[PDB]
């Protein structure tokens, strides 16, 4: 269902869905199983590009999140048209050796040609087996 994230841009992200999680309740990402994540956002600008930047933290310490496809245009219709709504469906496979944790803050910023497209932080992810 719909999950709660905190916006770090200008409210362009409208809804964020993770299968089988709800609101601000713990959302369990399983190691070694694909993680899927849908978003509904409004393009704040014309852009031919969309770059994903992830910073994530595990129990307060920064972590390099690997095997992330930075091109969001692989997961939505690009080019982007200013003022139109888009539906991105991103899929990232959690590596088996991904470290388990009950405290996980993830920041995702998407850059376009003319500036930040969208930004959100999520605090409720938990990594388990």
């Amino acid at each position, epitope marked *: 269902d719909q999950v709660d994230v905190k916006d770090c*841009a200008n409210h362009e992200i409208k809804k964020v869905l993770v299968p089988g999680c709800h609101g601000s309740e713990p959302c369990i990402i399983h190691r070694g199983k694909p993680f899927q994540l849908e978003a509904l956002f409004e393009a*704040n*600008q014309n852009s031919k590009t969309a770059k994903i930047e992830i910073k994530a933290s595990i129990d307060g310490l920064e972590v390099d999140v690997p095997g992330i496809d930075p091109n969001a245009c692989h997961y939505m219709k690009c080019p982007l048209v*200013k003022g139109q709504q888009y539906d991105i469906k991103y899929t990232w496979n959690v590596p088996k050796i991904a470290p388990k944790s009950e405290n996980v803050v993830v920041t995702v910023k998407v850059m376009g040609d*003319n*500036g*930040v*497209l969208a930004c959100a932080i999520a605090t409720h992810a938990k990594i388990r087996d």
Partner: antibody
Amino acid sequence: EVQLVESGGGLVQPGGSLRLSCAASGFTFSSYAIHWVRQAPGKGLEWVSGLSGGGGDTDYADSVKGRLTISRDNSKKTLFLEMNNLRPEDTAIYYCAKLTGYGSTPGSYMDVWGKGTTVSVSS
Amino acid sequence: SFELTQPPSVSVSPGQTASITCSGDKLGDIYASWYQQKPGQSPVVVIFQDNKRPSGVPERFSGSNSGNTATLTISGTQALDEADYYCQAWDTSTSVFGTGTKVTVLG
């Protein structure tokens, strides 16, 4: 309800320094980026600096780059602008302005502005 | 940084429609807003996203951003509309403000 109150301007010699505060009230300060916009006497608006809600993203104008630094204290609900090595052309009234979001994007707009405080730099 | 050019002044008769223009190399790729600064007061937003008017701002105010030119349109200009008008747009992280168009109503 939403209010910003500036202070710290003054007569300063070239090369002098000032610290500007902007004291906010009536909104969750930390949820919103706040920016400085200056205006020389009888002239137009010039953007100076901005800062995301978390204090993460400092951005400056090439004109002020290197001599000004922007900062927040969220507990105190206050935005600061430390101006050093000031120059005459930096003489103007300095407004702080709340954005509509946490971060500067193309859609962002300045929805609230203080009454301003006046900086004058002269020999 | 990119530059937004506005006419230096626009004079209008009471009840005439004023038309302030703001031009930039690629502005239809971005959003343009408009601020009104009456003498001795702080700026106030009147149009926020090309064609969007804040609740509170009078219905007479309208906007557009077609052709790489943003256009504020005050219909039925009154003596209250008599102020300096500044367009604004983002050069990524930099807020670019226009030169300024002083609207006078000949009353």
